[PDB]
Amino acid sequence: AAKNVVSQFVSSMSASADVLAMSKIEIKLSDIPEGKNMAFKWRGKPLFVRHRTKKEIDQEAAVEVSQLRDPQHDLERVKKPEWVILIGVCTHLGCVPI
Amino acid sequence: MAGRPAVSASSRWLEGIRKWYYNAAGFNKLGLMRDDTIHENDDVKEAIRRLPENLYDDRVFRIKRALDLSMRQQILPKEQWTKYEEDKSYLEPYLKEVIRERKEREEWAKK
Amino acid sequence: GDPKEEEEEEEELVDPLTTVREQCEQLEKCVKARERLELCDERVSSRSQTEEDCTEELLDFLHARDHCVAHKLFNSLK
Amino acid sequence: MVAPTLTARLYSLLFRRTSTFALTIVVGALFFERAFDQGADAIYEHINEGKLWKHIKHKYENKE
Amino acid sequence: MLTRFLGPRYRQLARNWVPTASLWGAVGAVGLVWATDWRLILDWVPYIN
Amino acid sequence: MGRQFGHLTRVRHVITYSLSPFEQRAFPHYFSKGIPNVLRRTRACILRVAPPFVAFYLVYTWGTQEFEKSKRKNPAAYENDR
Amino acid sequence: MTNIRKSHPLMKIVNNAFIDLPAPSNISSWWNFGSLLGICLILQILTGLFLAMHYTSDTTTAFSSVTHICRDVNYGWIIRYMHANGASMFFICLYMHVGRGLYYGSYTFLETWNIGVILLLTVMATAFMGYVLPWGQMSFWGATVITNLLSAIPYIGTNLVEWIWGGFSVDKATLTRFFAFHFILPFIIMAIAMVHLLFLHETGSNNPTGISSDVDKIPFHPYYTIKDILGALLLILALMLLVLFAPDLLGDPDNYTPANPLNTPPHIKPEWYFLFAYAILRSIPNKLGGVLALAFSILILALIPLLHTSKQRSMMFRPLSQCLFWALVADLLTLTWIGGQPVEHPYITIGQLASVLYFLLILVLMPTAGTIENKLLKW
Amino acid sequence: LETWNIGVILLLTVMATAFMGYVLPWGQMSFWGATVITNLLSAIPYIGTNLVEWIWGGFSVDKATLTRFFAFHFILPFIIMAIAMVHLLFLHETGSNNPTGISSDVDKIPFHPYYTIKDILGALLLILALMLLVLFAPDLLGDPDNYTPANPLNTPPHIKPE
Amino acid sequence: SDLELHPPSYPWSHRGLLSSLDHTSIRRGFQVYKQVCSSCHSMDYVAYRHLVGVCYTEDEAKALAEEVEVQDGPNEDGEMFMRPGKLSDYFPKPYPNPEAARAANNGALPPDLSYIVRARHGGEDYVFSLLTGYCEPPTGVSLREGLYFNPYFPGQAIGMAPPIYNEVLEFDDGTPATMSQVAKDVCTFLRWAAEPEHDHRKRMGLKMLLMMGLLLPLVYAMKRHKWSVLKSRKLAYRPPK
Amino acid sequence: HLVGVCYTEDEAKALAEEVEVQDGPNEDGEMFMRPGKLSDYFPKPYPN
Numbered sequence A: 001a002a003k004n005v006v007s008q009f010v011s012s013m014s015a016s017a018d019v020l021a022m023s024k025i026e027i028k029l030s031d032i033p034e035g036k037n038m039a040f041k042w043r044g045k046p047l048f049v050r051h052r053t054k055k056e057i058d059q060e061a062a063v064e065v066s067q068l069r070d071p072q073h074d075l076e077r078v079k080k081p082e083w084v085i086l087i088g089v090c091t092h093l094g095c096v097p098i
Numbered sequence B: 001m002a003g004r005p006a007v008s009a010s011s012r013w014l015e016g017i018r019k020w021y022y023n024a025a026g027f028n029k030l031g032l033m034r035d036d037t038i039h040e041n042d043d044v045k046e047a048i049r050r051l052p053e054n055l056y057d058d059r060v061f062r063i064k065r066a067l068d069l070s071m072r073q074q075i076l077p078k079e080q081w082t083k084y085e086e087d088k089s090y091l092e093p094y095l096k097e098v099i100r101e102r103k104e105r106e107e108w109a110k111k
Numbered sequence C: 001g002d003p004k005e006e007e008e009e010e011e012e013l014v015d016p017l018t019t020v021r022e023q024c025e026q027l028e029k030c031v032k033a034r035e036r037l038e039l040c041d042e043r044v045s046s047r048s049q050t051e052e053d054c055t056e057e058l059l060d061f062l063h064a065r066d067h068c069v070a071h072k073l074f075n076s077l078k
Numbered sequence D: 001m002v003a004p005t006l007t008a009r010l011y012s013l014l015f016r017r018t019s020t021f022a023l024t025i026v027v028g029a030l031f032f033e034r035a036f037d038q039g040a041d042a043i044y045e046h047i048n049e050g051k052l053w054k055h056i057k058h059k060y061e062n063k064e
Numbered sequence E: 001m002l003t004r005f006l007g008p009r010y011r012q013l014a015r016n017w018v019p020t021a022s023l024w025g026a027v028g029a030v031g032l033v034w035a036t037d038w039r040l041i042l043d044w045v046p047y048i049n
Numbered sequence F: 001m002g003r004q005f006g007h008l009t010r011v012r013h014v015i016t017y018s019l020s021p022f023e024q025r026a027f028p029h030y031f032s033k034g035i036p037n038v039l040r041r042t043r044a045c046i047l048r049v050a051p052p053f054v055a056f057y058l059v060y061t062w063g064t065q066e067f068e069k070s071k072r073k074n075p076a077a078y079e080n081d082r
Numbered sequence G: 001m002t003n004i005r006k007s008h009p010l011m012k013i014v015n016n017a018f019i020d021l022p023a024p025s026n027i028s029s030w031w032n033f034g035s036l037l038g039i040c041l042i043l044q045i046l047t048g049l050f051l052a053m054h055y056t057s058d059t060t061t062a063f064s065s066v067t068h069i070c071r072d073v074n075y076g077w078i079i080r081y082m083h084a085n086g087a088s089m090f091f092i093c094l095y096m097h098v099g100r101g102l103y104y105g106s107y108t109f110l111e112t113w114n115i116g117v118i119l120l121l122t123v124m125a126t127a128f129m130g131y132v133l134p135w136g137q138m139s140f141w142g143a144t145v146i147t148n149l150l151s152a153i154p155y156i157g158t159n160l161v162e163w164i165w166g167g168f169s170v171d172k173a174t175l176t177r178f179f180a181f182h183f184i185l186p187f188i189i190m191a192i193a194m195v196h197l198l199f200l201h202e203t204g205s206n207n208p209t210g211i212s213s214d215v216d217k218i219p220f221h222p223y224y225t226i227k228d229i230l231g232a233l234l235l236i237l238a239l240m241l242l243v244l245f246a247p248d249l250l251g252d253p254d255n256y257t258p259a260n261p262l263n264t265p266p267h268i269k270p271e272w273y274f275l276f277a278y279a280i281l282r283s284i285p286n287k288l289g290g291v292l293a294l295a296f297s298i299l300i301l302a303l304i305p306l307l308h309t310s311k312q313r314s315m316m317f318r319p320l321s322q323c324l325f326w327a328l329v330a331d332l333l334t335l336t337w338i339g340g341q342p343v344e345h346p347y348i349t350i351g352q353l354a355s356v357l358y359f360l361l362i363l364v365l366m367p368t369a370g371t372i373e374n375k376l377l378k379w
Numbered sequence H: 001l002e003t004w005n006i007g008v009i010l011l012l013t014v015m016a017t018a019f020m021g022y023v024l025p026w027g028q029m030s031f032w033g034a035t036v037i038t039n040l041l042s043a044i045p046y047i048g049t050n051l052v053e054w055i056w057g058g059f060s061v062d063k064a065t066l067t068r069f070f071a072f073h074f075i076l077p078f079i080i081m082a083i084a085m086v087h088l089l090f091l092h093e094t095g096s097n098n099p100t101g102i103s104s105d106v107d108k109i110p111f112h113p114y115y116t117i118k119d120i121l122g123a124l125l126l127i128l129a130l131m132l133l134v135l136f137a138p139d140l141l142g143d144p145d146n147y148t149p150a151n152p153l154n155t156p157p158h159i160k161p162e
Numbered sequence I: 001s002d003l004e005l006h007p008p009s010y011p012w013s014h015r016g017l018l019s020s021l022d023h024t025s026i027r028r029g030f031q032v033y034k035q036v037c038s039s040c041h042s043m044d045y046v047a048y049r050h051l052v053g054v055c056y057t058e059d060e061a062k063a064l065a066e067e068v069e070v071q072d073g074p075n076e077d078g079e080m081f082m083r084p085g086k087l088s089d090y091f092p093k094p095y096p097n098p099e100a101a102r103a104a105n106n107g108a109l110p111p112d113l114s115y116i117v118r119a120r121h122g123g124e125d126y127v128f129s130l131l132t133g134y135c136e137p138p139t140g141v142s143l144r145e146g147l148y149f150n151p152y153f154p155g156q157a158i159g160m161a162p163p164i165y166n167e168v169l170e171f172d173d174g175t176p177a178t179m180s181q182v183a184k185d186v187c188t189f190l191r192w193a194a195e196p197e198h199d200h201r202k203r204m205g206l207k208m209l210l211m212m213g214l215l216l217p218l219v220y221a222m223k224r225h226k227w228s229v230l231k232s233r234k235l236a237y238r239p240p241k
Numbered sequence J: 001h002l003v004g005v006c007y008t009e010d011e012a013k014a015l016a017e018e019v020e021v022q023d024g025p026n027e028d029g030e031m032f033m034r035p036g037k038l039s040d041y042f043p044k045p046y047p048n
């Protein structure tokens, strides 16, 4: 009995299912052209839409794998090098970029 | 309250109603005399302190066993109840003197 | 508007409720009340003007029938 | 609760030491809670057979 | 009030503490009037008119 | 809080006996004497408890009956006629 | 038991009042309501705090936030109903706490009893502003009639009503003030409840016999903690029975429509624990008389200790007073029944008679009952 | 030791209350000051994001977090009163301290006529200092950026707590 | 007329202490709402996502939501624009403001159907009797235009044309759309729209009864065991001489 | 707010009535224009 009632009160501060409904959003791709970005609301944080062009994809693979804190390639982070969607927050504390 | 012993009775005599009320009160069923259930104010408490040792010690056990009866929500057998006629005021003589003492003390601060 | 069907289909369809209306249409409670309903209707209609109606008598007739209707209505649904 | 009985071994094995007394309370809570939910829920389905969503969910999602 | 019974000793006690109780109600009167500027009362003082 | 066991009162010449809770049955003669007890307890109070609440039901059964009678129309259609 | 326990200048000695406190052995079941009241109090704070994490006091989003609590918040529906039905359990437990003192003469503890009335007033005030929080056509209108009763006072009645309202009528200004006031008042009750116990531990409990129990005191910890735990479960069972099987059994259905100042509900009435007070006020055509009688009936508790006449203290051995006590309880139930009914001809007579009997019993019949028995016992 | 340890607990409670109350105005310093500090809990291993969202009531600081803070900001100060009473309870048993640091049992004085009037003078110096800010420089300490409504899409020029 | 009639206590599939809602009826009950009620009755507290796991699947409810166009706030140029609805969208509002609603009807304002089961005396029993209780006005009663006689309605004159008749709609599963059957489904739906917690309310209720039905005898045993010392306690008074 | 600060009550009423404002649902259920009042806030140049 104690575990159930405690978990019921703890669960109240977690999801608030009306919040969970807006977890996934939909947005067009033809509104913005290549290079430019648009900012809107997703999960309470700003996210941007970017369209990689022909002369920027090649430079992505130019950086060596063993050059950052965590070794990560560029051909696996995206399902297709044509498009990319990213959340406009700082990876440290969550601050939007310019 | 319940039907009076005679037939139904509105108010007959005086000792009959008092005897009927004594059994109705029900403190005899716990083995307590009348003065074992009195309210202990600053007057009665002093008049208890003047009780003789034999009488005071008897009162302690009568109260002690009554609380045992009340704890179990039981009563004493029919033969161990406090008879109304056999009930006697062991505290009235001591109360009266404290009544006399307090009235004299109060009226001395008034005159 | 209320108990009509679109009709023209098979047997034009029927409702369980209107049949059950006939259940307390023979019960003793709802035949006596209907007798009172007629008396109010005959009395009120006869008078040229009267600020009275038969709502109370109708409600008494409805109260008896509807309660008996609710007893044996849901078994014919679903 | 007499000479060779279940409770005599139950007390000595577990309840003799208060440290193991708490173990059966927490371990017993694990097994009781798992069985109680399934035990109490299975009654609910029997009372409401063909009523809840899971009893009519099979009618959709390509299963019918 | 300010006594216990009805006797000459308490009657003297009540009379002896009347002037202090007499002026103690002024604090209850003026202080309450001062707190909420009781107009009907503030309309009679000459300097505060 | 200035009051604890040791100075509560003066008790003399009283002997008490008690048993270990493990050497006695928790529910001894539950229905053997408890049920005859509750009948004794209820009778001792039914003459002082029931009559006050029996009257309230009589008020209930009459105050509500009159209320519906007020809402019910009365045959006062005369003096108008046809 | 492990050592000499050493130490001691800490807060443990304050907890000796919960473990080593002497208590009468014959304390009946009518006493768990003391610990039940504490259980109810910390239960309202626990559920209330989690309710306040999703409730917004603005009128445009007050009612809609209550719906969001039940419809959207995970397990948020139960918390709202143990809060709504807990107040029903609070006042159920509150009225038996008062009733036991009436029967067992616990009002002889003048300090504790007087603080008890203050505790009663604080909860009734706290529960009143909580009902206005959902803002549901019973919150708006229930608060409309009750607060407008203060307009009967002269020279301050109109001034303080607007001061209470924060405007010319109940509105968003009143709603925000109530939620803030409803948040703080329960924490005042905790402080007073500790003060309430502080005036009782000096003299101990009050055995149903009514005689001094100093000869048969028992430790609290092994006997009454397990007795209060059983009493707590009976409270949880009773409260949870409402919440999980009839959540709206006590609450009025009209409260589920959003408050509309232009529309009046078919019947306007407060919650069931204030219904007896409503009947007394409605029994007098006068407006000033009604508000005074409404306050006097609640404040008559402080006048009870000054009306004691019997040489005994508890009603255990007072059969004449026992008949009057259950007549008062039955009459208090008649007042509750009258309050929930509209003001028509069968209830104006019953309402006036019940109210005139409520004051007549305590003020006249009960003190005369104690005097009569004093003659019957030769003292 | 008893009083000092309760003192740290008292300190932690106030900094929690002050931080939670700063988010109440919701003014681009409240939203973003709470954003950076609360996101620090995501660094906790294996439970960071689990409790960060449980604090947030969602995926980021939003209306769900704002309502929770106001309710939490209401309750915590009344907890501080209870702890402060316990804070004194662990001190009056062992007395007070002196600048000398030696036991002052040989030269104790009554509190009522000497320190009540000393605390009243100290209280006025507090009221004077507090009222000096309020009536002559109300926004001297607060950051000016807090007066623009919170905008999650825009970041302040400089992020910083009180 | 100004008189009250007590609604009959219709048996329900969810009238028991542990009985749950019939989710088959809920699915049919919504079909009444989306075709009959939604024309002039609002439900602004139930979303299209609420029907998931109750009466429709996720794909079913998404199709239902996308069937109705709704507003999606300001465009990039700061203008309104229509778009197909989503799961998170609430049920469409027939009118923008209550003033429009009073204009659409003969002044009467259709109450919100989200809580109408719990906001009326009698619950679904009154609503079911109200929907099916229409009858010809008795002799001696005159009704103004736009007013219809319904005894279950307080006042007996309601601004409601009979909204349910035989074969007014068509049910997906093929059950006959009779006058009484359609009212039963919407009443079942209107209860779920008012108390979505109804199933979990009883599910935890049964668990409580089994849990508390076992603990209460057990907790009583601990009380008796600890108190058995005082219950079996003999007092002896042995004063001197 | 400008009353008693920079404009009189009559001056501020003229300033407010000089600009039309949109508020109040008509009994037909539609928005309609009206001259502003003292209680009206300064007009918003753009809706969003």
Ligand code: HEC
Pocket (backbone or CB within 6 Å): I032, I036, I037, I039, I040, I041, I105, I106, I108, I109, I110, I111, I116, I127, I131, I153, I154, I157, I158, I159, I160, I161, I163, I164, I186
């Ligand atoms: C013709 C448009 C229209 C239709 C279609 C409609 N309603 Fe209504 N409804 C109204 C109006 C107008 C009122 C208010 C009547 C009044 O207050 O006199 C109302 C009121 C109600 C009430 C309130 C009754 C009361 O006593 O408060 C309920 C319940 C209700 N409707 C249910 C339904 C249901 C269920 C349906 C679908 C079968 C439905 N309505 C279809 C227009 C409509």
Ligand code: HEM
Pocket (backbone or CB within 6 Å): G041, G044, G045, G047, G048, G049, G050, G051, G052, G055, G066, G080, G083, G084, G087, G090, G123, G126, G127, G130, G131, G132, G133, G134, G182, G183, G186, G189, G251
């Ligand atoms: C003795 C303490 C309390 C009592 C007697 C009490 C009583 C009530 C009552 C009767 C209601 C009406 C609910 C309804 O009718 O639907 C209510 C609502 C409410 N209370 Fe309290 N309350 C107490 C303490 C608190 C506390 C401490 C808080 C917050 C910290 C709180 C927050 C709320 C809220 C937000 C509501 C509106 C939400 C709802 O009604 O479900 N309450 N309260």
Ligand code: HEM
Pocket (backbone or CB within 6 Å): G030, G031, G032, G033, G034, G035, G037, G038, G041, G094, G097, G098, G101, G106, G107, G109, G112, G113, G115, G116, G117, G119, G120, G123, G189, G193, G196, G200, G204, G205, G206, G301
């Ligand atoms: C939130 C409200 C209250 C709380 C938490 C509370 C708490 C308590 C507790 C725990 C006790 C001791 C338990 C017991 O002796 O049975 C007690 C005693 C008492 N209380 Fe309260 N109480 C509250 C309100 C009231 C009220 C409304 C009254 C009205 C008269 C009251 C009057 C008394 C009295 C007379 C006693 C004496 C008990 C005795 O005779 O031993 N209290 N209170």
Ligand code: HEM
Pocket (backbone or CB within 6 Å): H003, H004, H006, H007, H008, H010, H011, H014, H080, H084, H087, H088, H091, H095, H096, H097, H098
């Ligand atoms: C709201 C927060 C606090 C309140 C109301 C409070 C209150 C008090 C008061 C009134 C005293 C006695 C006054 C005096 O002796 O000068 C005291 C003593 C003390 N407090 Fe706190 N305090 C708080 C927070 C703290 C904090 C943050 C600390 C951090 C170490 C602390 C540690 C102490 C200590 C060490 C003493 C010893 C005084 C002595 O040696 O005479 N308290 N507290």
